[PDB]
Every structure is written in C-alpha cells, then in structure tokens.
Design a protein around this ligand. Sequence first.
Ligand SMILES: Nc1ncnc2c1ncn2[C@@H]1O[C@H](COP(=O)(O)OP(=O)(O)O)[C@@H](O)[C@H]1O
Ligand SMILES: Nc1ncnc2c1ncn2[C@@H]1O[C@H](COP(=O)(O)OP(=O)(O)O)[C@@H](O)[C@H]1O
Ligand SMILES: Nc1ncnc2c1ncn2[C@@H]1O[C@H](COP(=O)(O)OP(=O)(O)O)[C@@H](O)[C@H]1O
Ligand SMILES: [Mg+2]
Ligand SMILES: [Mg+2]
Lengths: 51, 466, 458, 117, 480, 253, 128
Amino acid sequence: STTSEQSARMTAMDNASKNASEMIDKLTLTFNRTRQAVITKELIEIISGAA
Amino acid sequence: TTGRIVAVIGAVVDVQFDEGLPPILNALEVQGRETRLVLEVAQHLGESTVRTIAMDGTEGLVRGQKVLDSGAPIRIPVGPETLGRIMNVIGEPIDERGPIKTKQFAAIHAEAPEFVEMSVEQEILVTGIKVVDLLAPYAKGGKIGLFGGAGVGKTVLIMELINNVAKAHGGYSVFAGVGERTREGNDLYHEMIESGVINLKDATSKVALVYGQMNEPPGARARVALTGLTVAEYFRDQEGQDVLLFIDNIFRFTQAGSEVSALLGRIPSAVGYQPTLATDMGTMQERITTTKKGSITSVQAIYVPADDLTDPAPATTFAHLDATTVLSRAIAELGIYPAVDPLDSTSRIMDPNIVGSEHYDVARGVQKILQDYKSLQDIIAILGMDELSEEDKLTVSRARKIQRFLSQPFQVAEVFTGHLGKLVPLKETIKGFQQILAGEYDHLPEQAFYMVGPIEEAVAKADKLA
Amino acid sequence: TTGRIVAVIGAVVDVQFDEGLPPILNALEVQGRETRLVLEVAQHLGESTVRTIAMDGTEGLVRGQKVLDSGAPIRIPVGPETLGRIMNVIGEPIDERGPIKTKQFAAIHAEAPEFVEMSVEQEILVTGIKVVDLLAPYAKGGKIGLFGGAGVGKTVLIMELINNVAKAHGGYSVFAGVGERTREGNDLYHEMIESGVINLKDATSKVALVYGQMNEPPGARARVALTGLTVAEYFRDQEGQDVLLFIDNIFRFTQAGSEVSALLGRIPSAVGYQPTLATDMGTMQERITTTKKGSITSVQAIYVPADDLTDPAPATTFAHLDATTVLSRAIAELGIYPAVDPLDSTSRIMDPNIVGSEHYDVARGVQKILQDYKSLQDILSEEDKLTVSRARKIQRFLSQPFQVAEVFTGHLGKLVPLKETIKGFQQILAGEYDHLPEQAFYMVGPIEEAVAKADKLA
Amino acid sequence: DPNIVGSEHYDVARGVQKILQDYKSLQDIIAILGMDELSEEDKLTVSRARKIQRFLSQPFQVAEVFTGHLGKLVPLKETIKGFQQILAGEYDHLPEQAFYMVGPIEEAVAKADKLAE
Amino acid sequence: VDLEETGRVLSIGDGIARVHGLRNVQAEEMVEFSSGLKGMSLNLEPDNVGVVVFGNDKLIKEGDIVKRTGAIVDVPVGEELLGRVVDALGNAIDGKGPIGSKARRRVGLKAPGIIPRISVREPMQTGIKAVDSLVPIGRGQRELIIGDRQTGKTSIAIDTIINQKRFNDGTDEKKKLYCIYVAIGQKRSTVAQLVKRLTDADAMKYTIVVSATASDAAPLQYLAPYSGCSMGEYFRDNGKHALIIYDDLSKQAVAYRQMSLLLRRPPGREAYPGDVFYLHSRLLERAAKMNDAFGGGSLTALPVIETQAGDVSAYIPTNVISITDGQIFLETELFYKGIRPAINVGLSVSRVGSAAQTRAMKQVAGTMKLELAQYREVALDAATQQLLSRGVRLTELLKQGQYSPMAIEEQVAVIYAGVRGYLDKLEPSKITKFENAFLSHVISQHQALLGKIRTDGKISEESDAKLKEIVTNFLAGFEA
Amino acid sequence: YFRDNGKHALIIYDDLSKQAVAYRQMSLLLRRPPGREAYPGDVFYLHSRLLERAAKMNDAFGGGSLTALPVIETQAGDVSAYIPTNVISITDGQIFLETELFYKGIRPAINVGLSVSRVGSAAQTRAMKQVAGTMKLELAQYREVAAFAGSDLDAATQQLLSRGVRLTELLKQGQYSPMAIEEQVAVIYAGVRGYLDKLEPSKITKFENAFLSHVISQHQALLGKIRTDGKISEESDAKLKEIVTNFLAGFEA
Amino acid sequence: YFRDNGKHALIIYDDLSKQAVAYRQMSLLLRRPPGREAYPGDVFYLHSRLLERAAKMNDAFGGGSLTALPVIETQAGDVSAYIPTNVISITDGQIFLETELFYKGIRPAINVGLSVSRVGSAAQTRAM
Ligand SMILES: Nc1ncnc2c1ncn2[C@@H]1O[C@H](COP(=O)(O)OP(=O)(O)O)[C@@H](O)[C@H]1O
Ligand SMILES: Nc1ncnc2c1ncn2[C@@H]1O[C@H](COP(=O)(O)OP(=O)(O)O)[C@@H](O)[C@H]1O
Ligand SMILES: Nc1ncnc2c1ncn2[C@@H]1O[C@H](COP(=O)(O)OP(=O)(O)O)[C@@H](O)[C@H]1O
Ligand SMILES: [Mg+2]
Ligand SMILES: [Mg+2]
C-alpha cells in the first residue's frame, strides 16, 4: 500500500506543480499588462498637468 | 440676427454675431447646406463669438458661411403621432414615410423633476428570467441598468426584456438607439412591423423609435439620448399613461461627450474623460424617472470599457440605478447565458419586507454557496475536486448545479441555440433553487440543470441520460 | 546661405535664416568650433526659424553663431574603401587610420525602394551553419532577430556569418553599433582583427563598421543605424550584392528615437515610447529588402525589457522579422556550439515552395524527434531506445566548429553547403548511422566526417 | 555594531532577527501543509520564534485603554538577557501567551503560573 | 497674390502643416502642395488652416504655395481598379499605368441608415471547412478576424479571395464577389508576395489592393481603409457584391494614435484618443446589405485585430468586437498542437451569418455543432467516452491545409462522414488520410452527386440514401 | 449650532467621493492644473478642513459635540486611491466593508481586522467594555489560524477556530433593528464566555433570535439592571449564566 | 587626472539615483519636456556621459585606468524602473543586494545568481 501511495503522490504533486506553473504564467501576463498600464497613466497625469 | 463661421474643427464650430447673441443651448441653422445642419450653442467665448457643436458632419463648411439663430433650443415632434415612426437627433423623420405632423413640439433640453415630484412606490416586475427574478428583481417604474463588456449579451438581454414585459404592459414604449449598430435598428423595426406592435397601415402602433447610431459624429451621439428621452417624457406627464424606456447603449452618450470635450478646450479628467462627466450624466439621468404624475420603467444597456467596471463611465452610472444586472465574460465563456454575475447584480427591493422571507432567504442561500465555491476555486485548480473534504465536495456539486440552473434559453436566442424559449414564473423559480439548496437533487447529473426552464425540466432531462 | 543660432536647449538647436530655409532632414554645419558639429533639421517653427537635433554636444554655443546649410541630408562616405574602417554617424573616421579616401558619397536619409522595385522571388541565404540552414534558414532581403543573453556566442556567430557569407557568395557585411558601450566597441574591433574579418595590412576586410556610442546625444544614436544602412545600400544598388547588415542593438535604436521625440516636446505614446514608434521603425526597416539589383539582409540583436514580449519596443520590431536565431545558455553549458536552440529558432521561409521539396520534410522530422525526446525525458521501452539515441545523435550533429573559434579550440572550422546539410540529417533519421556512437557527431562538418571520427576511436 | 553596543548585545539582536527570518520561510510551509509536517527541529524554532514575537511586545504607559493593564519600563541589560534565554531554549516549557504584553522576562514566568489556575 | 483660392505654409513639423490664407477652403477638402503632395483641411481657424499631409513632410517647407482642389477628399472608384495595386490615394503603384476611372467617391461618406438596409441572406463562402460550417459568413456582414501574430489571420482572408474564382468565372452575376484587400502597416515585401500569390492563382483579376505600408506616412495609413471602403461601396450601391478586408485595423489605430498625440489631443487607455472607437465604427458601419430598391448589392467586411498574448479584453479588441457581427478567434496554443486553422470553435461566433448558410451545410453542421458543444464540458463510461470519441474525430475534419479552399458540396460530404458515424471505428490520427482518400474518390467517381447537391443546395431523400451507399462501401474498402 | 449650544449632533456625509468629483470639475474648468487622478492640489484640504470641524467641546463652551460619519466609496477594493487615502489619514477610525464578506453571509460586512477606532473603550459603556475587551485579540487569534488550517489541527488550535467562528456568527445582524446596549452585551456574553463553543455554527443566528426574545419577555428586570447600572453586576453575571446554560441544553435537543 | 598620467583611480558615485533626482528638478523647472517618471529625455545621456569616461587606457596613452562603482537605489527590487534601467544597461556588471539575504545572515547580501560581471574572469588571479 505504501509503495502504491508514494508513487501515486509523486504524480499527484507533479500534476499540481504543472497546474501552479500554468497559473503563474497567466498572472505574469496580467502583471505585464498592469505594469504597462500604470506607466502610461502616470505619464498622462504629468503631460496634462504641464499642458 | 445673422452669424458667420470663424472656426471649424470636427463637431466643434465657432460662430460670430454682429448684433444679438444666441443664448447657450440654442439651435442654429447653417445656410448653404443641402441637408439641415443644426449647431447647438455650448459656450459663449466672448467678443461676440459662440462655441457650438454640430448634429451632423461638418465637411463642406467654409469660414464666412452664414448661420441663423432659431430662437429656441432643438425642438422635436412629441405626441401620439410619433408612435410607429423613426426619427433622428433633431426630430427629423428617417423612415421615408413623410412629415411627422404633431400638434405639440418640445425642446430636447429640460430641467429634471423636483424632489416633491418623486414617488416612493416599489413593486416587483416579474421578468420571467431566473437570475433576475431570484437575485436582483426589477421594479415597476424603477430604473434598470444592464452592465457588460464587448459581446457578453447586453443587447440580447434588453431585446428579451422587451419581449417579456412590453406585451403584458398596456401602454406606450420608447426605444433609443444610441451609438450602436444600425443593422440592429433595421432588425428591430421590421420585426416590430412583423409582429404588429408597429403599424404602417394603422395608428395602433405602441412603440416610438429614435436613432443615432455609431455612424454619426459625436454631436449626434451626445444628444440623441435626450431626443428619445423627450418623447418618453411627454407620455409620462401629459397623459398619465405608463411608459417603458429602452436605451441601447447609454455609454455612447458619455463617450461622445468625451470626443467633443477634447475640442472644446477643456482640461481632461482621469482616463482622458471630460471634467463634467458626472454632472453631464446627472442632468441627463435625472430626467429618466417616475413622478407622482406618471411612471417610467427604464431599462438601459451600459457598455463597460475594456471590461473595467471601475472606469469612470460605468462606475458613475451605478448611483442612478434601482436594479443592476452585471454581465461577466468568464461566466459567458463557461457557456452560461444570460451571463449574469450572481455576486455583482443588486436590487433595492431585495428585502424580506418587500419580496417575502422565503424569497429573500433562498436568494441569499444561492449567493452564500456560490461565494463559498468561488473561495475554493484556487485549491480546485491546483490539486483537484477529489482533494476536498466531504463538506466542501457537497457544496461544490450543489453550487455547480445552481450555476447551470441559473442559465436560461431566451426567445430572442431561438436561433443561436436552436432550443425553445422559456418563461419561468417567480414561485417556480424560488421553489427550484430552494430544493437544490436543501439537497433534493444531489443524485442528478450537472448537465441536466444546464439551459432549462422550471425545475421539472431538469428532472425530465435527466431521464434521457439514464 | 548662412544661418544664426537663436536658441540652445540641451541637444535642441534653433536656427534662423534670412533668405532661404533648409528643408527638413538637412544637415547644418556649425561654424567656429574645433570639432565638426552637425545639426539635423527637424522642424520649421515659422518666422524663418528651424528646429534641429544635435549630433554632438552643444556646450559653448552662442546665440547668433554662424551655421552653414549643406543643402542636403548628412552625406557619408561609401564604397570599398569603407571596408575595415570605423566611421561615426556623420561619416568621420574614428579609428585614427587617416581619411576614408572614398570615390562616392551618399545621403543617409533615403526612402525605401518602391513597390515596383520589389523582388517577388523568395530565396534562401545559405549561411553554411547547420543549425540555421536546416531549421531556421535566413531569407535573402529579410530580417533576423538574434535572441540570447551575454556570453552565449553572439559575436562569434556574427563574425562567422561575416566570414561565411563573403566566403561562399562574396557579399560584404556592415556592422552598425547603435548606442553601444565604448569599451565593448573597442573589444569587438580587435576581436574582428583576430578573427580575420577585418584586416589592417591589406584590402581583404569583409566588414565596414559604423559606431554610435552611448555617451552621444540621442540624435546621433538614432541616425547611426541609417548610416550603416546607407553603407550597405551602396553595394546592393551600385554593384548588385547580397549584403549583410548587423544591427546591435535594435532596442537601443528605438530607445534613442524615444529620446529624440521627448527632446522635441512630443507627447509620448504608451509605456513612454515615441508616438512615431511604428513609423520610425517602418522608414528604417523597409530599406532592408530584395530589389532587382540585389538584396540587403539584416541580423538584429534583440533585447526584451522586463522580460516582457508585449512591450511596444520588441512588439513593433517582431512584425518586421522573417526569422529568429535563439541562443540558449543551457545548450552552451552542454558544450554545444553554436549554442542554438533547435526548437526556439523559427523561420517563415520554412515552406516547400520557397525551399526545396526535399528541405521541408527533413526539417519537420528533426523537429518531431527533438520534441519527442524532450517530452519523454521524464523517465525503459523498445520504441524509445531507438528514437532517444537518434535524437541525441542529431543534437551533436547540429553543433559545428567555427573558423572564428580557433582561439578557443584547436579544431578547424568548417563551411557546410546546403545540399550536404540536408542529406546528413536525413541519413540519421532514416537509421543509416544507428551503428555509430554518440560522440562521432560532436563538432564535425559534413556527415563524411562523422564516419571518419567513428573509425579513429575504434 | 559590535564595537559600539557590545558583542553580546549585537549577537542577540542578530540571533533574534535570524530565527524570525527563518520562521518566515517556515510560515510558508504551515500555510499549505500545516503544523503536522514540520520536523522536531522545525517546530522547536517555530515555538521559540513565536515566543520571541510576543516578548518584543510590551504594554505602554500611554495605552491604558487599549491593552487593559498598566505600562512598564524595561532596562537594557534585562532586555538582552531575556531574549538570550529564549534563544537558548530555557523557556520551551512555558506557554506561548506568557510572553504576550509583559515587561521583563521575570513577568513572563509569573504569568505562566497565572494561566493554570 | 490670391489668399482666397491659394495659401502658403507658415510652419511644418508636428505632423500637421499650418497654412496662411485659403479663406474659401472647405472642411475636409483636399489641398495641393507645391512639391506635389496632397493634404486635408482639418482645422479651420481664424488665422490659419491645419492640414493633414498624405506623405513625407520633408518635401514641405515654410513659404510653400498651397492650392484648393475644391473637392471633399475623394478616391476613384469603379471596375477599372480590378487587377490593380493602388496606394491610399487611389494612385496606381504597380507600374501598369493610369487607371481609366470615371466616377469618384468621398472617403468619409456616412454609412447607410436603417431603411436602405435588409437582413443578410446570401452566403459568403470562404472555402474553409471550419468557417463555412460553424462560423458562417453572410453578404453585407461584418466578421472580425482576431488573434495573436502568426496564428493564421491573413491566411483566412487570402484563402477567401482565392475561393471566389469558382463563382467569378461562372455564368451567374448575382453570385459573383469582387474582392478588396487593404494593407495597413504591413511590409512592402509581404504585399508584393501577396499580389504574386493572387496573380498565379488567377484571383487578382477580381481583386483591388490598397496599400499603405510601414514606410508610408501615418495619415496615408489612417486613410487607407476609408479609400478601400469607398471602392467597395461602388459595388454596394450598384447591385453588385464586394468583399473588403482590413489587414489590419490594429495598425491603423497606431497610425491614428500618432496623429492624435502629435495634435496634442488628450490620450486615454494605452495613450489612445477618445474617438478611436469612432475611428473604426464609422468605417465598418459602411459595410451593409442593401434592399431591392437600392439594387440589392452588399459590402462584406473582414477587419483584422492583432491581440497581444491572447488578450481580448484590451481596448482596441473590445471596440471592434462591439462593432462587428461576431468574431473568428485564433489562438497560439491551438496552432502549436496541430489545429490548423487555429480557430477556437467555442469562442467563435457569427451573429447574423447563420441565416446565410446553404440548406445542405445546415443539415450536417448543425449536428456537428451540438456534438462539439457536448464534447467541450468533458474534455470515463460509455456515455461520455462516446462524446469524447466523436469530438476528437470531428476536430480532425476541421483541420485544413492552405491554398485549397473547398467547394460547399465537397465540405458537406466530409462532414457527412464524420457526423453519421463512419469515423467512429477509425483511430483519430489517421482521419486526415481517410478524408483525403474519401474526397478524391467522390470527385473522381461521383461528380453526378456533387453537382446534384450544389445545384439544389440541399440533401433530400434522393441524395441521403445515395450518399449512404457511397460512404459505407468506401469505408469497407478503406483498410489503413 | 447644536455643538455650540450644549447639544450633541451627528452628521453623515454620503458621500465625500462624489463631492471631490464635483470640486474637481470646478477646479479644472477654472483652469487650475490637474494632479493625481485629475484632482486639484487642495483636494485633501477640502476634506480635512471639513472633518476637523467635528469636535467635543469643554464645559465652558457648553459641553456639546459634533460627530462626523464621512462615507467613501472605493473602486474594486482599491484603498490605495488618492481620495480614500486622504480620508483614512484624517479620521479617528475606519469601518471597512467588503463584498466578499457580504455574500458570505457576514452582514454587516465589517472587516474587523482592517477596522479600528482610536478612541476605543473610552467610548463604551462599562457593560460593553467587559465583553468586547477580549473579543479583539480572540478574533485576531482566530484569523491567524483561519488561513493556517484539512491536514487536521490539534485540540488547542481547533478551539481557537471554533471560538472565532461562533463570535463571527454573533456579529451578524439584520437591518432596521438597531439593538439597545443591554441586549447587545447579553448576546455577546454567551459567545465570549464559551457557552456556544460546542454548538453547531449554523444555528447560532437562530439561537440569538429565540434567546434574546426570551430574555426580552421574561427577563426585563435583568436587562433593566444592566442598562441602569451600566455594568455587569456580580448578581447579573450569575443570572446571565443561569439563563444561558439552561437555554443551551434545551436548544441543543 | 590619474587615468591620464599613468596612475590608477577608483570612483564611487553614492548615489546616481539622487543625482538624477537633482537633474529632474532642474529640467522640470526650466519647463523641459517631461517623460516617464517625470524625467527628461536626456537623463540617459546624463549617466552615459559620466560612466563612459571610466576606461582602461593602453600603454601608448600611459596605461592608466579609471574604475567606476556607481550606486543605484531600487524601490522594492524594481530593476525595471527608469533610472535603474538606464544604469544597468550602461554599466559592465551588477552587484545585487537583497533584504531577505541580509536578515537570513548572508551579509554581505550578494545574490550570486543575479549578480554578474561579463568581464569577470579576465581580472582574476591564477590562484583565485
Ligand atoms: N442569452 C443568450 N443566449 C445565447 N447566446 C447569447 C446570449 N447572450 C449573448 N449571446 C451571444 O453573444 C453574442 C453577443 O451578444 P450581444 O447582446 O450582441 O452583446 P453586446 O450587446 O453586449 O455587445 C450573441 O451573438 C450571442 O451569440
Ligand atoms: N562557436 C563557438 N565555438 C566555441 N566556443 C564559443 C563559440 N561561441 C562562443 N563561445 C564561447 O563563449 C564565450 C563568449 O563568446 P562571445 O561570442 O564573446 O559571447 P558574447 O558576445 O555574448 O559575450 C567565449 O569565451 C567562447 O569560449
Ligand atoms: N491552415 C494552415 N496550415 C498550415 N500553415 C498555415 C495555415 N495557416 C497559416 N499557416 C502558416 O502560418 C504562418 C502565419 O500565418 P498568417 O496568416 O501570417 O498569421 P497572421 O496573419 O496572424 O500573422 C504563415 O507562414 C502560414 O504559412
Ligand atoms: Mg450590443
Ligand atoms: Mg497577418
């Protein structure tokens, strides 16, 4: 049982480590969009304040 | 008496008068144009020069071209002989059926009804739609808003709400196409001719149409909401008869206001918007209301820029509403229609004192389990549903069945689905969800609850899969 | 005519003219200065006054100082005499070897060839390198994006490309240093002497260098790529050659264009970049092309800011690239040279109608086996034992000893023809060399050398 | 700096900081897998780090309405010694809430008796 | 000397030229510069005229004479443009000579209103299996092609133009479709290769190409879709049918954003102007289906939007989605896996195009649509495994090569085999091989039935049992 | 006026978010340059000078007061925004409300962790201080273990989770039924003293309704004594204990 | 001076972040066009002029050298900030410091993986 339990856990956490990595990848793309969005927003607030 | 064009850019046109200057909001007539070009005075710039905004294309205008003051603001046809007709911003007929000979005219600008004119009546309007009636029901004479991003189903929802309510409402209805698709106006017009709610042969017509779509310059789109509003206003006051006002889409009002604001020499607000955003919307929205004199049940489709509900345009709109229906892209992409977010749709009448103690408790029960399911979403995606406890697995299965039972086949979406349109009574909607919450259909499969009418059809669908 | 300075703000110089105004993009010569200061006309402000960007420092300038109109945009030296020499943006030599005694001159601001001048034929530029020719081939009159960090073999690959193209085809190369470190500009110059692509004692130099260092004003770094482009344009238009243009680095070209825009008071677009971002790129990139006379093919070093590929700087660039050469550090650590990632590197001209009808299937089979090898690296079964071995024997055959790499390793460099490259990888896939060990393919030219290496250590 | 506050003072300060920084990385484990997964060495440092967290806290004499009980001043030499004792594991037998909102280390011992009965 | 019909340049640099005089000039009127360049009167001001320059503004100096043309910005239209490659102004850039154009149309003409329009009913065949079955396009419709770079966006458009030859050669004038391809921001090489592909496939003879490349000035790129639309509007109002493709509208917005920011207009999301939605909306609204009283012509639009990282919630994508009548969505993940075309059937919608689909195609695609819809919630007992078995098999049928757009009756044959359960016992990896062998069989042996379905547009009792014997007998023969 | 005439008044600004929007419009159209989120430079001083006018006067000035309850609306919970960050730094405390808690059944949707009051127990009756004094930390110990827990927890940490869950259920309250302070103390008493620790969490709300109405109809003398005395008497503590323990066992069956 | 007269000099700019802040104040108040983070479009030109002046001269020019150790202060490790961005690309290499390493006990708090010197090896002695 314990030989079966351990090897099945090996795959279970391997699949979970794949799911979490796919999740990071999707959030990283969101981070980059938000990072670009903040830069532009700060920049407009300066241009407008000058003009 | 006579004016002269001195500056032209986009919809913003400057006119200089030698003697007698036109007051703000006055309609001006441009001479030398083959079709009528109305300039609406917005600002007095000084030195006898006014800043105006057009209602049609300003191409073919010359510096020195003559402009005449009409003496009044833009005036449109109002009354019973507008029913069954289509008109533009300045009240000109666009159905090729001739002149709209009305006994009364009214200016598109008017002051909003005073505080003493307000009515406090709150009475449920059963839409026949599950997500709406259960969680955030609409009110008679109340203000309804339909939020959503690009393609989630704002138009499809407002068209189903026309079909469900307007038939059972023995009164007049007004549709205002604002900055939307012109072919949608063609579809609505000929469908109404087909059904008989608009008649060309007879005066039995019940709906008045006003259109200024996304092919029009910002001046037209910015004002067209008032033109359809003024038609609706007349029917409320000088008759007493109840009115339905449908607007698609009200965002185009504020968007067009942003386009002209850039040319009026304003300092921009946040997100590049107009500094007068909230007050422009305020003086416009407060005209759409029920009074002691008459009742207006308004439904407004509200676009959401880049799906951002914190955008100044949709964000400011919330306070002008009595019931909200927010549509989500993620809920749409799961196959749920209508794509109503159960945890972002609200109603002022969702209250045990108004809708009943059983109605309220079930509504809050449905919401509790969906928020509990939303909290587990992360662990479900990492590990799996099989790694959950016996308590959590039970809520997940029930919540997933509740999600699907919230969806509904629409009569307007009889082609998009190929299925039959379903209209579900309130008592049967409450009963349906109540049984799933108490654990009466735990044995039944998920897909049985997907796209059904009442609870009985969920059982009958499960029999075929046995 | 003569002009007078009326305003000096940083690298922006305003000049008034009494009689005639110099059109935009004209080069202005400032009088009464020790070193030649050029001003490029950018705007006509009105009242007979023009706005210019400075190509060098503006310190010591007085209001009313004389300025001469050249009557033309910046004119640089062109010809065979440019080969082996380093010039700045304006055309002065910066290698201290005397004047660039050229026969012709050409203006750096030239329009892209017309639609009718375009060559419809799609051809493969044979590099001789095996990883490229098979999987991610370079197109004649195309753009190639060179990906990779620091110390993976970018300069060695560049020096070999200069060597290989001029060796087999006879086409000269041009290097444009856009906003590069002066120290690494110095190091690159001598490494090219050591490799042989630049010779100082005869006229066999294969590269003409164009430098625009980091310590220079935005204007100079902005136009430096156009200067190298003009150097390359001569060999194609006048002498009909398939020329290489090396741009390092393409992001720094974009960076300097943003700075010019910001200096001129222009409201910045998204992420702080210039509003003319796509048009600054377009008017530059469209000069790199195949015409009736010949072709200009460019290898462009890529930097991806914040490791974000959707950034406007790389995003605008990507729409111009025809191929990618992705270098990897992990493959460099495995000892494989060149350190090319055989899956990351892609090319648009991988089509059975452009390249031979024998080319496409072979390269797809190589791609299939390498993907299958990486997918099954998690874990003994029969079908795997044959495919795992074959894929490892393909990776090692993808490696190649470079002629430039004699200072690193003692092995002799090789130029492998396209026909010999195709048949080689085809034979490993079919199973002809299943009886050979893995190390037989590591660092060899053609597949006849893979046979000979297996005999020696047997 | 060891050449200013003393080598004894400095090493306790860094020692307290070290176990709290190491506890932060251990907090990342017990957030997902739980307390049962930690080694006997791990839960020894956790219990010590949690006791050090609380011993850093003290009742102020201007905050009578917030914490309930009066405030008190703690001498420097007693402060170094107090944390020094916990780092050595001299109070691994005392409960966790005994170190919460007290003065010197002597008050933590007296509070430990008061939690029993 | 004549500051009424003439003018002179005051200043030039920030995208727009300031011009003294031109007192009698109209708003949105084309002007004429000394150097040979044209421009548009945008800002009519008390003291000057702001002019948008259609070209390289290096050729314009202070003091240069500017003349009125007297006409609102227009472009040449008509059938003379077919087979020609023009720039944004309608000037021939293929060296084949002047275009003998008679009529001219304004580029900024307002879209037809409610009354002149009617519901779409005529099919617009792409030749692609996945499109003509699951996302059917009608004539007069707007259908957005959306996705990341190199997902296959342009490929959809080109295969559609190539497909039309089968109609444009036949003796049926109503079923013909004249194509227009607008190139915005693309490389000049990509367009030069594109014209050759159409030339060799004999598709160019009914195609007009409007090109404003990456080296062309931003105003020219801004104008290019409006000039192309006017050329398509000629067919629309004259009882003929035209297809327009904007490749791409994403780069037009970048070109307009440049203009707007140089004009110092207040930016919003992604530094875009507030009228950027209006920039696309007025253009795509001009694509319409006209009723009998207006000749019965139509203009079908296929705008292209390049997304970043597969994001469809972005500002420009959300605009055009809320303009068009549905979207064909492509995904990089699908392309890498072998799904080519990389169409996401789940997220792809055709709003009004469902009515414009042949009776035969509706008889097979309807049940394929449902079975694919059934397949998506599970992607294992005999109930769900069968849906998973049917799913992957039908998916292989949606896979298609380039440059061979199929006829409707050929498409209706291959979907028939999948839907009626002839693939069920065959393994998923070899379905393509079966599809090719089956198709080459029916074209070689049964031209009587393929010509029967196409003419009727329908599969009746006569053809259904006729097609039953054909597939069943072939499947017994097919043994690999 | 009330404040300066020996009287106590309560003002509610609903909301200062929309006031700032209105002031921005004015300032922008007066051609005053925009700053963060287009707001003018003095938008902080707008609200500061307003809320400073709320005060408690000394006896020589009348002993009157003015209490202020400003309202601020956030966007998607963004407490970092220009306007909200100003008003948080002005006020003597904040009551944080969240949609997540609202739909979880926690109504009112008060985030206890984020919400504070600088005046504290000095603004409470002697009765409420006795029961709520422990609640703060007891709930803080709970939230620590909440995002710390099905790997099975020990008896001590499961107890902290149980107590916290049961106190949270007591903080739930419907609308338009504001409770007197003596009725509040009584229901808090039962939870804080552990008399509900072994009760199923779903019936705590049900418990409170029936328990309170029994104390209202049959034990007015107890509530009346807590109201008038202002604290929990030793006799009142004994009586409260007598009712809750016997009610417990009846309800449990 | 040392670099040109054969001698070897080392310079530490502590720090360049604040120098850029001083120059931003000057530029903004002169009404020079503001860019990202309010910095003018010549702030790169500012740092590149200074740091490029650090060099190793050949024996023909005396064989002197000037080594530069400029300092940049990041905010929450943001290397993508405008001033950190400019200086990273200008400099030959970076020595990275982190708060977590410092309080773990690893002080000096240098990330071996993140820190880089692409010259590096050519400087080291045979023993090293
Ligand atoms: N209730 C629904 N049932 C079926 N399909 C729907 C529904 N709502 C929306 N859709 C799908 O979404 C598409 C866009 O709907 P629409 O109302 O036009 O979006 P919006 O008006 O918000 O842009 C429709 O073509 C339809 O296919
Ligand atoms: N083709 C190659 N063959 C052998 N070694 C190589 C090759 N390319 C690079 N290297 C090794 O990598 C190191 C750095 O190479 P270089 O081209 O200078 O990279 P970079 O230009 O990115 O610094 C060299 O010291 C060399 O040993
Ligand atoms: N159905 C297909 N089968 C095989 N290759 C395809 C297919 N569609 C596109 N491609 C290839 O993919 C590449 C990118 O296609 P393209 O249409 O240019 O995408 P995009 O328009 O998004 O850039 C082209 O080189 C083309 O040959
Ligand atoms: Mg809509
Ligand atoms: Mg494309």
